[PDB]
Amino acid sequence: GWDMQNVITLDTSFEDAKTQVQLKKIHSSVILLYCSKDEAVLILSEARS
Amino acid sequence: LGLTGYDFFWIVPSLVSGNTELIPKEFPSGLISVSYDDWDYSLEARVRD
């Protein structure tokens, strides 16, 4: 099936703006994350928030 | 969250739409509300009633 719901590219300012709107449309599913460790920390903190 | 738009109809009581002269910028257009009429039910008619 591979129902890839959406592709999100956080350019910058993960907590400032323009990224919360994209991250808020992700529903219960598997989230393939590609970034660096020091940046995956921020992305996962925002995702928990 | 993408919950406001053409396809979503937010219906609210008179509690949030009070003082219709003050409209926050965060209220979507088409925000259906119910309230006591202050347009056609004039104060003179109110006192007479």
Tab-separated table of C-alpha atoms in Angstrom:
chain	number	residue	atom	x	y	z
A	1	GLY	CA	0.000	0.000	0.000
A	2	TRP	CA	2.572	2.575	1.161
A	3	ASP	CA	0.127	5.370	1.955
A	4	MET	CA	2.757	8.092	2.279
A	5	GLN	CA	0.559	10.793	3.779
A	6	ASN	CA	2.851	13.805	3.420
A	7	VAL	CA	6.446	14.979	3.068
A	8	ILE	CA	7.591	17.712	5.459
A	9	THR	CA	10.837	19.662	5.025
A	10	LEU	CA	11.642	21.850	8.040
A	11	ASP	CA	13.850	24.479	6.410
A	12	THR	CA	14.665	26.356	9.631
A	13	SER	CA	13.166	27.908	12.770
A	14	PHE	CA	11.670	24.687	14.105
A	15	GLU	CA	10.096	26.388	17.132
A	16	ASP	CA	9.577	29.881	15.693
A	17	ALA	CA	6.973	29.491	12.934
A	18	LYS	CA	6.041	27.846	9.621
A	19	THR	CA	7.089	24.472	11.066
A	20	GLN	CA	4.388	23.939	13.692
A	21	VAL	CA	1.754	24.205	10.955
A	22	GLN	CA	3.424	21.446	8.936
A	23	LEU	CA	4.130	19.222	11.941
A	24	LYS	CA	0.562	19.529	13.261
A	25	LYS	CA	-0.975	17.755	10.247
A	26	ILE	CA	0.836	14.478	10.997
A	27	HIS	CA	-1.626	11.934	12.373
A	28	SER	CA	-1.031	8.567	14.055
A	29	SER	CA	1.462	6.867	11.732
A	30	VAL	CA	5.143	6.092	11.195
A	31	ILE	CA	7.332	9.185	10.863
A	32	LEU	CA	10.548	8.649	8.905
A	33	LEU	CA	12.884	11.384	10.147
A	34	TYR	CA	16.051	12.464	8.315
A	35	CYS	CA	18.257	15.076	10.003
A	36	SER	CA	21.325	15.278	12.232
A	37	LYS	CA	21.488	14.132	15.844
A	38	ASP	CA	21.817	17.638	17.291
A	39	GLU	CA	18.837	18.565	15.092
A	40	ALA	CA	16.827	15.389	15.666
A	41	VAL	CA	16.926	16.372	19.340
A	42	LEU	CA	15.100	19.625	18.574
A	43	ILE	CA	12.689	17.974	16.140
A	44	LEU	CA	11.737	15.252	18.625
A	45	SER	CA	11.359	17.785	21.445
A	46	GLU	CA	8.975	19.798	19.269
A	47	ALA	CA	7.133	16.616	18.284
A	48	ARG	CA	6.633	15.714	21.942
A	49	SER	CA	5.424	19.267	22.563
B	1	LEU	CA	-4.511	22.652	12.961
B	2	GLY	CA	-6.385	22.948	9.666
B	3	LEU	CA	-9.781	22.785	11.386
B	4	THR	CA	-11.049	26.081	9.917
B	5	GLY	CA	-11.913	26.726	6.294
B	6	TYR	CA	-14.676	26.429	3.736
B	7	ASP	CA	-15.661	22.925	4.865
B	8	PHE	CA	-15.755	23.583	8.639
B	9	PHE	CA	-18.612	25.473	10.303
B	10	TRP	CA	-17.900	26.717	13.827
B	11	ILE	CA	-21.158	27.359	15.698
B	12	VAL	CA	-20.901	29.219	19.000
B	13	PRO	CA	-23.302	30.620	21.592
B	14	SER	CA	-23.707	34.271	22.570
B	15	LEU	CA	-20.928	33.829	25.140
B	16	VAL	CA	-18.052	34.235	22.677
B	17	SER	CA	-19.757	36.640	20.242
B	18	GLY	CA	-20.768	39.177	22.875
B	19	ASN	CA	-20.149	42.855	22.136
B	20	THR	CA	-20.437	42.394	18.379
B	21	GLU	CA	-18.607	45.718	17.927
B	22	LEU	CA	-15.364	44.006	19.044
B	23	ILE	CA	-14.233	41.248	16.672
B	24	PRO	CA	-10.861	39.548	17.262
B	25	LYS	CA	-8.680	38.886	14.245
B	26	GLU	CA	-8.670	35.172	15.163
B	27	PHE	CA	-12.399	34.711	14.526
B	28	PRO	CA	-12.906	32.953	11.172
B	29	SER	CA	-15.441	34.410	8.793
B	30	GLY	CA	-18.617	32.380	8.729
B	31	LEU	CA	-18.507	31.917	12.510
B	32	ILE	CA	-22.177	31.148	13.136
B	33	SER	CA	-23.435	32.450	16.476
B	34	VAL	CA	-26.751	33.066	18.227
B	35	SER	CA	-27.474	36.156	20.287
B	36	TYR	CA	-30.206	38.434	21.563
B	37	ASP	CA	-31.083	40.937	18.845
B	38	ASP	CA	-29.804	44.468	19.442
B	39	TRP	CA	-30.538	45.669	15.886
B	40	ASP	CA	-34.291	45.385	15.287
B	41	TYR	CA	-35.523	45.130	18.902
B	42	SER	CA	-35.150	48.794	19.801
B	43	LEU	CA	-34.696	50.122	23.325
B	44	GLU	CA	-38.009	51.989	23.183
B	45	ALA	CA	-39.751	48.725	22.305
B	46	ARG	CA	-37.826	47.073	25.148
B	47	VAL	CA	-39.075	49.630	27.674
B	48	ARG	CA	-42.622	49.382	26.323
B	49	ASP	CA	-42.508	45.587	26.657
